[PDB]
Amino acid sequence: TFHVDFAPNTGEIFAGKQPGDVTMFTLTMGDTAPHGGWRLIPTGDSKGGYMISADGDYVGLYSYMMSWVGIDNNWYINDDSPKDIKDHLYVKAGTVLKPTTYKFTGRVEEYVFNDKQSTVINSKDVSGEVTVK
C-alpha cells in the first residue's frame, strides 16, 4: 500500500557551472490508505540536506515539492491524497558540479494527524548515487 521509489537521475549530467537547475535524484512517495503527510530526513554525512562526492565535497540540495525546516533536519509536505507524489532533489542553476559521484542517504516517513500531534505510520531508508563527467 505505502511505497517509496528513490533514484539517481536516469539521464547524464556533466560537470561545470550548471546552466540550468538539474535534478540529482527523483523521489516518489504515495499511499492510498489514509494519511496526513510525508517527511524526508537526510541521515549520516547528508544531515543538513547534502549530497557528498567520492572526493568529500558537500553540495546542498533543494526539494521541488517539500518545505525545508533547518531546526528539525527535514523536508516535509502535508498531503491527504492517494496519488504518487513526484519530487526532484536538485541543484540550482549556477551550482558548480565536479566529475565525481555524489551520494545521498535519508529516511522517508509517512505520518497521520490527530488534532494536535503527528504520528509515523510507515518509514523507508532511501539511498542513492549519481555520477557526473
Side-chain angles (χ1 to χ4, degrees), residues 1-5 27-31 35 37-43 106-112 119-127:
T1 165
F2 160 84
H3 73 294
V4 174
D5 320 300
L27 193 222
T28 168
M29 304 181 291
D31 194 13
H35 64 262
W38 300 86
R39 68 167 66 89
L40 170 58
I41 305 149
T43 56
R107 190 170 56 258
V108 181
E109 285 177 354
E110 187 196 3
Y111 52 90
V112 296
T119 295
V120 182
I121 73 197
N122 301 273
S123 175
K124 197 199 201 178
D125 287 353
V126 306
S127 182

Short mmCIF file of all heavy atoms in Angstrom, two decimals, residues 1-5 27-31 35 37-43 106-112 119-127:
data_model
loop_
_atom_site.label_atom_id
_atom_site.label_comp_id
_atom_site.label_asym_id
_atom_site.label_seq_id
_atom_site.Cartn_x
_atom_site.Cartn_y
_atom_site.Cartn_z
N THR A 1 0.84 -1.24 0.00
CA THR A 1 0.00 0.00 0.00
C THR A 1 0.88 1.31 0.00
O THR A 1 0.91 2.03 -0.99
CB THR A 1 -1.12 -0.10 1.09
OG1 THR A 1 -1.70 1.19 1.36
CG2 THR A 1 -0.58 -0.74 2.43
N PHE A 2 1.61 1.57 1.10
CA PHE A 2 2.71 2.56 1.19
C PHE A 2 3.89 2.15 0.30
O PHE A 2 4.26 0.97 0.27
CB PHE A 2 3.16 2.68 2.67
CG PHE A 2 4.55 3.25 2.88
CD1 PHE A 2 4.75 4.63 2.93
CD2 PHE A 2 5.63 2.41 3.10
CE1 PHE A 2 6.02 5.16 3.15
CE2 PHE A 2 6.91 2.93 3.33
CZ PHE A 2 7.10 4.32 3.37
N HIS A 3 4.45 3.11 -0.44
CA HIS A 3 5.64 2.87 -1.30
C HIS A 3 6.53 4.11 -1.51
O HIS A 3 6.05 5.25 -1.57
CB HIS A 3 5.26 2.23 -2.65
CG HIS A 3 4.59 3.16 -3.63
ND1 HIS A 3 3.34 3.70 -3.41
CD2 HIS A 3 4.98 3.61 -4.85
CE1 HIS A 3 3.00 4.47 -4.44
NE2 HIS A 3 3.97 4.41 -5.34
N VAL A 4 7.84 3.86 -1.59
CA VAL A 4 8.84 4.90 -1.85
C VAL A 4 9.83 4.43 -2.93
O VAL A 4 10.55 3.45 -2.74
CB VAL A 4 9.56 5.38 -0.55
CG1 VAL A 4 10.69 6.34 -0.86
CG2 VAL A 4 8.60 6.09 0.41
N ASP A 5 9.85 5.13 -4.06
CA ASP A 5 10.94 4.98 -5.04
C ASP A 5 11.87 6.22 -5.01
O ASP A 5 11.40 7.41 -5.06
CB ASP A 5 10.40 4.73 -6.46
CG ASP A 5 9.17 3.77 -6.48
OD1 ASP A 5 9.35 2.61 -6.03
OD2 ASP A 5 8.06 4.17 -6.96
N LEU A 27 12.27 11.48 -6.28
CA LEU A 27 11.76 10.96 -5.03
C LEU A 27 10.28 10.83 -5.19
O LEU A 27 9.54 11.82 -5.21
CB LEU A 27 12.04 11.94 -3.90
CG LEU A 27 11.89 11.57 -2.40
CD1 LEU A 27 11.23 12.66 -1.58
CD2 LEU A 27 11.18 10.26 -2.11
N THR A 28 9.82 9.60 -5.27
CA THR A 28 8.38 9.43 -5.40
C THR A 28 7.71 8.66 -4.22
O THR A 28 8.14 7.56 -3.80
CB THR A 28 7.99 8.97 -6.84
OG1 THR A 28 6.62 8.56 -6.85
CG2 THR A 28 8.85 7.83 -7.31
N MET A 29 6.67 9.28 -3.68
CA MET A 29 6.04 8.82 -2.43
C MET A 29 4.53 8.69 -2.60
O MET A 29 3.90 9.63 -3.08
CB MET A 29 6.31 9.87 -1.31
CG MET A 29 7.78 10.17 -1.08
SD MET A 29 8.04 11.35 0.23
CE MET A 29 7.39 12.89 -0.44
N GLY A 30 3.94 7.58 -2.19
CA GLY A 30 2.48 7.51 -2.18
C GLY A 30 1.85 6.37 -1.41
O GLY A 30 2.45 5.31 -1.22
N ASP A 31 0.60 6.59 -1.01
CA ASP A 31 -0.22 5.59 -0.31
C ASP A 31 -1.69 5.96 -0.54
O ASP A 31 -2.05 7.14 -0.45
CB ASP A 31 0.06 5.66 1.20
CG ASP A 31 -0.47 4.46 1.99
OD1 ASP A 31 -0.85 3.42 1.39
OD2 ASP A 31 -0.47 4.53 3.23
N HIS A 35 -3.85 9.28 5.39
CA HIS A 35 -2.61 9.86 5.93
C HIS A 35 -2.53 11.38 5.83
O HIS A 35 -3.31 12.01 5.13
CB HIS A 35 -1.40 9.26 5.20
CG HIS A 35 -1.35 9.60 3.74
ND1 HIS A 35 -1.80 8.73 2.76
CD2 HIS A 35 -0.91 10.71 3.10
CE1 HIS A 35 -1.63 9.29 1.57
NE2 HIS A 35 -1.10 10.49 1.75
N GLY A 37 0.70 13.28 5.76
CA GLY A 37 1.91 13.86 5.22
C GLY A 37 3.14 12.97 5.14
O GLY A 37 3.13 11.78 5.49
N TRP A 38 4.23 13.60 4.66
CA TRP A 38 5.45 12.90 4.35
C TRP A 38 6.59 13.80 4.74
O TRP A 38 6.49 15.05 4.64
CB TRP A 38 5.56 12.68 2.84
CG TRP A 38 4.49 11.89 2.27
CD1 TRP A 38 3.27 12.35 1.83
CD2 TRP A 38 4.50 10.48 2.00
NE1 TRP A 38 2.53 11.31 1.32
CE2 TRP A 38 3.25 10.15 1.42
CE3 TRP A 38 5.42 9.47 2.20
CZ2 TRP A 38 2.91 8.85 1.05
CZ3 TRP A 38 5.07 8.16 1.83
CH2 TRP A 38 3.83 7.88 1.25
N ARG A 39 7.68 13.19 5.22
CA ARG A 39 8.90 13.97 5.51
C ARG A 39 10.11 13.20 5.07
O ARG A 39 10.13 11.97 5.16
CB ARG A 39 9.04 14.38 6.99
CG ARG A 39 9.27 13.23 7.93
CD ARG A 39 9.71 13.72 9.31
NE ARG A 39 8.66 14.48 10.02
CZ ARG A 39 7.75 13.92 10.82
NH1 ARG A 39 7.75 12.60 11.02
NH2 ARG A 39 6.84 14.69 11.42
N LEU A 40 11.10 13.93 4.57
CA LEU A 40 12.38 13.29 4.23
C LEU A 40 13.45 13.78 5.21
O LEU A 40 13.65 14.99 5.40
CB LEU A 40 12.77 13.53 2.74
CG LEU A 40 14.21 13.11 2.31
CD1 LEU A 40 14.49 11.61 2.56
CD2 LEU A 40 14.48 13.49 0.85
N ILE A 41 14.09 12.82 5.87
CA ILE A 41 15.12 13.10 6.87
C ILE A 41 16.48 12.68 6.29
O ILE A 41 16.78 11.44 6.09
CB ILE A 41 14.85 12.42 8.23
CG1 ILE A 41 13.46 12.78 8.77
CG2 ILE A 41 15.87 12.87 9.29
CD1 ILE A 41 12.85 11.65 9.60
N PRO A 42 17.29 13.68 5.95
CA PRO A 42 18.64 13.41 5.46
C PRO A 42 19.49 12.85 6.64
O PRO A 42 19.58 13.49 7.69
CB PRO A 42 19.12 14.76 4.93
CG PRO A 42 18.16 15.78 5.47
CD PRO A 42 17.01 15.11 6.13
N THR A 43 20.01 11.63 6.49
CA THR A 43 20.78 10.95 7.53
C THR A 43 22.31 10.96 7.27
O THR A 43 22.76 11.24 6.14
CB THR A 43 20.36 9.47 7.62
OG1 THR A 43 20.51 8.83 6.32
CG2 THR A 43 18.90 9.37 8.12
N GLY A 106 18.94 9.02 3.22
CA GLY A 106 17.86 9.65 4.03
C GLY A 106 16.84 8.67 4.55
O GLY A 106 16.94 7.46 4.30
N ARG A 107 15.85 9.19 5.28
CA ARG A 107 14.72 8.37 5.73
C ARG A 107 13.42 9.08 5.40
O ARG A 107 13.23 10.24 5.79
CB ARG A 107 14.77 8.16 7.24
CG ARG A 107 13.80 7.13 7.81
CD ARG A 107 14.09 6.79 9.29
NE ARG A 107 14.11 7.96 10.19
CZ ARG A 107 15.22 8.55 10.65
NH1 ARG A 107 16.41 8.09 10.28
NH2 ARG A 107 15.16 9.62 11.45
N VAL A 108 12.55 8.42 4.63
CA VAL A 108 11.21 8.99 4.37
C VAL A 108 10.23 8.47 5.45
O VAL A 108 10.24 7.27 5.83
CB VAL A 108 10.67 8.62 2.97
CG1 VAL A 108 9.30 9.23 2.74
CG2 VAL A 108 11.64 9.04 1.86
N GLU A 109 9.40 9.37 5.97
CA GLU A 109 8.41 8.97 6.96
C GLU A 109 7.04 9.44 6.53
O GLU A 109 6.82 10.64 6.22
CB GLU A 109 8.78 9.53 8.34
CG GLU A 109 9.93 8.79 9.00
CD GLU A 109 10.35 9.38 10.34
OE1 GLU A 109 9.85 10.45 10.74
OE2 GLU A 109 11.21 8.77 10.99
N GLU A 110 6.12 8.48 6.51
CA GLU A 110 4.70 8.78 6.34
C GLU A 110 4.05 8.90 7.74
O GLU A 110 4.24 8.03 8.60
CB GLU A 110 4.04 7.70 5.48
CG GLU A 110 2.59 7.99 5.08
CD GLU A 110 1.82 6.76 4.59
OE1 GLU A 110 2.38 5.62 4.59
OE2 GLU A 110 0.65 6.95 4.19
N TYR A 111 3.31 9.99 7.96
CA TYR A 111 2.58 10.22 9.20
C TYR A 111 1.07 10.56 9.02
O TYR A 111 0.61 10.92 7.92
CB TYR A 111 3.25 11.33 10.00
CG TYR A 111 3.50 12.61 9.25
CD1 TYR A 111 2.55 13.62 9.23
CD2 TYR A 111 4.71 12.82 8.58
CE1 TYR A 111 2.78 14.80 8.56
CE2 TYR A 111 4.96 13.99 7.89
CZ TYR A 111 4.00 14.99 7.87
OH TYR A 111 4.24 16.17 7.19
N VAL A 112 0.31 10.44 10.13
CA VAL A 112 -1.11 10.85 10.20
C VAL A 112 -1.29 11.88 11.30
O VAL A 112 -0.53 11.88 12.28
CB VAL A 112 -2.04 9.67 10.51
CG1 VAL A 112 -2.01 8.65 9.37
CG2 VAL A 112 -1.69 9.02 11.84
N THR A 119 1.97 11.44 13.90
CA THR A 119 2.44 10.12 14.31
C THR A 119 2.82 9.22 13.10
O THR A 119 2.00 8.95 12.22
CB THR A 119 1.38 9.46 15.22
OG1 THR A 119 1.27 10.23 16.42
CG2 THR A 119 1.73 8.02 15.59
N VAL A 120 4.05 8.73 13.09
CA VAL A 120 4.60 7.95 11.98
C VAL A 120 3.91 6.59 11.79
O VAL A 120 3.94 5.73 12.67
CB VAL A 120 6.16 7.77 12.18
CG1 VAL A 120 6.81 7.00 11.02
CG2 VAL A 120 6.86 9.12 12.38
N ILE A 121 3.36 6.36 10.58
CA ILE A 121 2.76 5.05 10.23
C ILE A 121 3.53 4.17 9.28
O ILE A 121 3.23 2.97 9.20
CB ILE A 121 1.31 5.17 9.69
CG1 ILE A 121 1.32 5.75 8.26
CG2 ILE A 121 0.44 5.94 10.68
CD1 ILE A 121 -0.02 6.29 7.80
N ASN A 122 4.47 4.74 8.51
CA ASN A 122 5.45 3.94 7.70
C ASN A 122 6.79 4.68 7.53
O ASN A 122 6.89 5.90 7.72
CB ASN A 122 4.96 3.57 6.29
CG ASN A 122 3.67 2.75 6.26
OD1 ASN A 122 3.69 1.51 6.35
ND2 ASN A 122 2.53 3.44 6.04
N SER A 123 7.81 3.95 7.13
CA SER A 123 9.13 4.54 7.09
C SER A 123 9.99 3.73 6.16
O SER A 123 9.88 2.50 6.14
CB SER A 123 9.76 4.51 8.49
OG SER A 123 11.10 4.96 8.46
N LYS A 124 10.83 4.42 5.38
CA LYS A 124 11.79 3.74 4.47
C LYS A 124 13.11 4.53 4.31
O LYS A 124 13.10 5.74 4.14
CB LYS A 124 11.17 3.47 3.09
CG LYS A 124 11.95 2.43 2.29
CD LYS A 124 11.60 2.53 0.82
CE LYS A 124 11.93 1.25 0.10
NZ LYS A 124 11.54 1.38 -1.34
N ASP A 125 14.21 3.80 4.41
CA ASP A 125 15.56 4.31 4.21
C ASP A 125 15.75 4.44 2.72
O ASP A 125 15.56 3.47 1.97
CB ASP A 125 16.59 3.31 4.79
CG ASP A 125 16.63 3.30 6.35
OD1 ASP A 125 15.95 4.16 6.99
OD2 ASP A 125 17.35 2.44 6.94
N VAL A 126 16.08 5.63 2.27
CA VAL A 126 16.47 5.79 0.87
C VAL A 126 17.97 6.04 0.79
O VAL A 126 18.61 6.55 1.73
CB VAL A 126 15.64 6.89 0.14
CG1 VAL A 126 14.13 6.59 0.30
CG2 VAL A 126 15.99 8.29 0.65
N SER A 127 18.54 5.67 -0.35
CA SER A 127 19.96 5.80 -0.57
C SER A 127 20.16 5.81 -2.09
O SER A 127 19.48 5.07 -2.79
CB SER A 127 20.61 4.59 0.06
OG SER A 127 22.00 4.63 -0.06
#
